[PDB]
Design a protein around this ligand. Structure first.
Ligand SMILES: N[C@H](CP(=O)(O)O)C(=O)O
Ligand SMILES: N[C@H](CP(=O)(O)O)C(=O)O
Ligand SMILES: N[C@H](CP(=O)(O)O)C(=O)O
Ligand SMILES: N[C@H](CP(=O)(O)O)C(=O)O
Lengths: 462, 460, 460, 462
């Protein structure tokens, strides 16, 4: 059930049902940091598939045998399509260049291509991991290329679609709640009116701006390092390889990938991952506020604010009979907190480049992909399992709004804020309504108050 | 307008005649124009340098320093320590990472003030030489870390812990005062089962008690002083016993248990103790965020919020929303909490980036630690005196909110939770009281026996 | 010693006769004693308030404000904006989370200075009333955010970007100057293949160019002003057109493309644009950490380091290690970089903690954003003028380090990597040159043809 | 291959080969945030096993049938021993109280106990998830209890043993290198001498202090919330239950667990997790410095510092023939960066408690366990695969040290620092040695220099 491969350190049993070789087994022995939970994220593996596919096709221009190139392309496609995920056992906590994973990809594509050409697994015949699959490449330019492909795909496939669904659901609710006049709260204190639609329009703008911020952080993610080789010079690669590989990846993905104009900047730093993480960090601040507001507006049902009725997805507590909780708000705010921590991890990695290579690469892409996936998935879940089903408690909203002492703000231009403040202070002290306190105080008539104090008229400038 | 003329190996320098600093300091002001006066080395570091140079001058008498000179250095150093010469320190945090510029600034000011006391000429280095006398047996590499730990320890003992002690005592007083008031608990922000306002406040008391324990637990390695390590930690060109004598002198002058760092390489190459102390203040900030934010929300209204607490009014109300008054001390405290968390990340990045024999992020690290300690201390005093001590319970409102809670039916769980859930769901749907006799699970007399909030405050 | 007497609803207040602030400001100094003078509201916020109140006064003439009063408010506001009245702002960042105390401080100072210009009595609110005239059509809730964005935009355009532009141009000059010098690359800190010192520096140039692009990309939503939202964003008790006219007036006064925020609820309830701008400065800090740290290590020695660069000497050497000179500008820059990263976390925590219609972490958020922008700007100028422009290449040392590198045998990969690895391993073990003819893989003439560093700088 | 269970929302197919029930399947449908990578960490599941075992035994004092109690204890033990890991499919990104996981544990222990008593899976007969397995408990007090048990075990079993191995290996090297005189570097510049043993003693102290800091952060992790129930009052639990459960967990683990003196503090906040994360954050700063120093000291072999020879564990690069890299230093520094980010995630969660319950619990324990595991595993790997095999390049060290211009510091007390500075400046400008420059300058004789400038004599105070 094992074959035998060798490196300069000894012989290695390799499971016969695995496409990886001696370098990968050696790497599993040397980097036992975290369990299977710490394995290189799938999107990086798939991006390596896309990248090696592109390199194999392009390398035909620079002397790669079409028969071999074709088999490498088919094997690479299987990696990209997630058919060979079980042949990647290596953790994030490896070489800072992601060398072990590049070798893992080179070995798996080599042996799968060998199998397709009816060769012997482990023979490197006729497909050699270094001479064919890694031709014109280093880990130094391929791992960054895989990071940017993986990041771009996760943003377009998961993060932005998630935020789009949340935007559309919040906007629907904004329109639905456009007529409902509620009380504003500033410093958590009773303030002047606004519509529940107006409050929700704030959330809509925040999510719209989140998608703008993420798109604004993508242009330099579309720059691929492929062609820089060891130090960015492109030593032992051919003129045009960098441009052709980038164009091939753009064609394969339908995303506007281009070669990095400066390969030194592309290898020595991952400032684009720090930039993208920063956009997701801003998104996390927006989502924390939206989810926390909805949590508190839905609080009660009796001794909270109780302005919103949130959908019940789970049965109530057995220890507090029938009690139901804003559980999607909790999942979203926990994700928001995680993204903020991930961002600091990305920042520390990004700041610690040395000369020609930043060697924090696996850690940086792990945190960026984690944040993008969590934000995308949480946005869908928060939308489908909370936002779309939110109802307004119109009776309660109307009571809380009408009872607010700060409706006397409407009397500011009519009787001055000194007299308005006396009415509010007196009504508060007496447990009285504003109307009767103003009549008893003799600042206006019952008919004047009913003309000057209409919530419907306090929703815009005059 | 009045300037004297000093020289360094780079040229002549105009030095204001009314300043005790010299050529090294003026040169440093020309080379490090990063941030305005707001970015000047914090006063506690300057004062700690005063204490340290005072200790070194006295101790150096054992190692050949003229008592006449030593005495004048001690008097001038004491003036620095007492904050009499703060205007003679114009240098910013954003200087050499060893804090060399500030050490030289201290050496020059003490030198010229001592010269003045001995009737010499300012700028002459006669008879008190900044390097040969004031900096004798020392480097910036061991003195700046010594000043950091002295400054940090004094700020913790004089500002941070006294602030938290006042907050602890005020919260504990309120816990006792509110021990009889039964309110409704909130979990997930939802109506929960009863607890006393005293019980809720006892949580806050424990958090502040544990904050003080955490800060004290982070101090033992702050009491380790680098003084004696000189350039790289070997103690090259310093005398045997100097390290122990200077530490003992600082302990005697401050009444704090300062000792020489057992490993001077660890003391110069890293400031892990500042990262540790920042971490304690970071935990404290999480506790204070929770306490201040809870009190903010419990005080919300006065009508369309929770309105359980009445917070003292310290300012007149808004003119834009007439008479509106806000939990302003809660805002100051929660903004401070957020600042401490950011400061902690700055300290961590500095702490992680030591190179070989010297960490050269020293000024940035102590600035953030002193900022956090000062803000936490001052905010704790202000939050205590201007909010906590004056908090009142809205007993009428609390009683209504608690009695009306559907989750009082939890008391019926051991008596009759399936049936309890039906009562709560029905009462909720009907806008009825837990009347809902109608369901026929108990008599009016049984409900009055089985549902007493007074009995739901403990295990049985 | 000279005091006048003002009143609020809480009592009488002594106000220094030589101060333009009033009862609200003195009350605020009594209630918010958190940090010393170092924690005072940053000057750029005060100046931005000057610009904003100037704009409001002029625009308010359309909505019934007496031109005589309006004119005096405009002159007094201009003095605030020009930094003539900085001593009349004693309030700290750690106040109300809306920045209400500072808005009142601005309203009072402009009121009393305008009163003085019109020959009235200081403290009288006659004929210029702080609330009725200077604060007309406004709340703190929409004015403080407006001041934050004006202050942030001006600091970015006047300090941060000019600083990075100088650094970009200086690095680019050096890139061109060093375009012919072939050095050894380092990956994992290990000896790698050649690149030019110009190529390495072109990396730094791109990083700074992209930093300026990132900051500019983060500005569009900073140009959105909240002015017109008043209390909760509805614009209650303000006039139609006021929001657009005030934004257009600020744009005209500053020459920056300020516009009214399309959604005033988003503008009051959150400061996501400050979190976005802080994020751009956070990325910039990662770029500058790398550039400054690389130059620090490349300049290391002069004998037992890398010693590829000769950094300008700006200070005299150490007296403790005679003549020793250090990369002090690199230390100032990397300490600033670490500070920006911490500041960013403070901004993020504040930004995440909005409640309903108002985020009340406003002063803390703008303090951290302005701190980061100022430090990055000033450090970029200082690092440029006092280090980068004067950097020299040690061509003799660079040439030795590069020619002796075992990884020049990489050039032989396409000619003869198994054989290339044997040559490197043998030369290393023997302390020999790549002589190692002995292995017999090529002739002395073939090696001289196949191994030219000049040919290893590009793809073929 | 499926049985059928019901909740108030519909019928649910439950795989017959799974011990979880309707609440768990419902939770998998409602919380699709991240894949299997985001599943509740195993140590939390195992800690739930220990906790439910303790509760079942103790509950016999308060009316739980011994027959049932015994079966619950056996099933709980299987969870604790990691025999039933595949029956826990729920993610971290659930209810902030960890309610879904508590229910998952209650269901699995219920059905496994039912199976042991020959009952029908899904019947809740005779072992009821709520009435028996969750007896005297809430999620609010059990999830915090599981967090502290999991955290304490990870610290004692993984983190501290890892740091102990690193401490001992660094101390061995300190002793081994005690005679080797190298050049100190301050600001990265050539400084005065110290032994390689002295430099390594710095690292030893940092790791010793790391273990002290972690132990100093444990006392409040040993406080268990069990007994607080819903809000901390202990409503619907029995007097003595809190103390007995804590004592039982202490006995089962051999760790000094005690009941939290204040259950309000224990439910409303997780300040102890923030405290422990802070200790691991300080540890990360220490390990960043140690790993980065060793990386740079091992740099070359020719155009770096080259003072250390690091063990080769992998074959050299094929693109740069024979090039070998400090890969364990990279794994360690990437872990250090991750711990710093995790710490910010923990801090944000810890700061955001509301009234009687902090609902960031799963996110906080995930980050704490991640940091502890990574630090522990990286410490072992860095020790075994780098530190124990480090050699000194004595020839190179001796050259770099003897050539340093700052050996003239030894002449400070003999000829004053002004004359010493002239010698250094002149020798530098002339490319000369200190000795001959001092003779040519005429500040001392060849015999005086050889007496006054001995590196052996510059290693201590005089
Ligand atoms: N990691 C690369 C070499 P590779 O491309 O083999 O990963 C380096 O040493 O710089
Ligand atoms: N900064 C110190 C020496 P000093 O004591 O002069 O500050 C160094 O160069 O290592
Ligand atoms: N702070 C504002 C009002 P102001 O404009 O008085 O600052 C509020 O109470 O919402
Ligand atoms: N989560 C608890 C109830 P449970 O114990 O069922 O998890 C709450 O609502 O406070």
């Amino acid at each position: 059930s094992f074959r035998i491969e060798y490196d300069t350190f000894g012989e290695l049993k390799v499971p016969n049902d695995k496409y990886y070789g001696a370098q990968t087994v050696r790497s599993t022995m040397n980097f036992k940091i975290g369990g299977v939970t710490e394995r290189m994220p799938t999107p990086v593996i798939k991006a390596f598939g896309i990248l090696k596919r592109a390199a194999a096709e392009v390398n035909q221009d620079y002397g790669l045998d079409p028969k071999i190139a074709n088999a490498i392309m088919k094997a690479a496609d299987e990696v990209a399509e997630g058919k060979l995920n079980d042949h990647f056992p290596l953790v994030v906590w490896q070489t800072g260049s992601g060398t072990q994973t590049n070798m893992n990809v080179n070995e798996v594509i080599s042996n799968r291509a060998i199998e397709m050409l009816g060769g012997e697994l482990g023979s490197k015949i006729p497909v050699h991991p270094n001479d064919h699959v890694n031709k014109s490449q280093s880990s130094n330019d391929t791992f960054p290329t895989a990071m940017h492909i993986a990041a771009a795909i996760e943003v377009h496939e998961v993060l932005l679609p998630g935020l789009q669904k949340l935007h559309d659901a919040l906007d629907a609710k904004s329109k639905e709640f456009a007529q409902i006049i509620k009380i504003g709260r500033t410093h958590t204190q009773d303030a002047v009116p606004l519509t529940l639609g107006q409050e929700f329009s704030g959330y809509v703008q925040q999510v719209k701006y989140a998608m703008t911020r993420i798109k604004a952080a993508m242009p330099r993610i579309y720059e691929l390092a492929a062609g820089g080789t060891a130090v960015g010079t492109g030593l032992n690669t051919r003129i045009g390889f960098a441009e052709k590989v980038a164009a091939k990846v753009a064609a394969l993905t339908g995303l506007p990938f281009v070669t990095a104009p400066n390969k030194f900047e592309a290898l020595a730093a991952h400032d684009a991952l720090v930039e993208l993480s920063g956009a997701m960090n801003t998104t996390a601040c927006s989502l924390m506020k939206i989810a926390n507001d909805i949590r508190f507006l839905g609080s009660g049902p009796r001794s909270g604010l109780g302005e919103l009725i949130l959908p019940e997805n789970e049965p109530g507590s057995s220890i507090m009979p029938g009690k139901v909780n804003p559980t999607q708000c909790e999942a979203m705010t926990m994700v928001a907190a995680q993204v903020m921590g991930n961002h600091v991890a990305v920042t520390v990695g990004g700041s610690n480049g040395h000369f020609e290579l930043n060697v924090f690469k696996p850690m940086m892409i792990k945190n960026v992909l984690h944040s993008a996936r969590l934000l995308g998935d949480a946005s869908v879940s928060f939308t489908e399992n909370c936002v779309v089903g939110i109802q307004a408690n119109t009776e309660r909203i109307n009571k809380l709004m009408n009872e607010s002492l700060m409706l006397v703000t409407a009397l500011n231009p009519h009787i001055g804020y000194d007299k308005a403040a006396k009415i509010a202070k007196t009504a508060h002290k007496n447990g009285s309504t504003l109307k009767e306190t103003a009549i008893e105080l003799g600042y206006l008539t019952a008919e004047q108050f009913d003309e000057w104090v209409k919530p419907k008229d306090m929703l815009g400038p005059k």
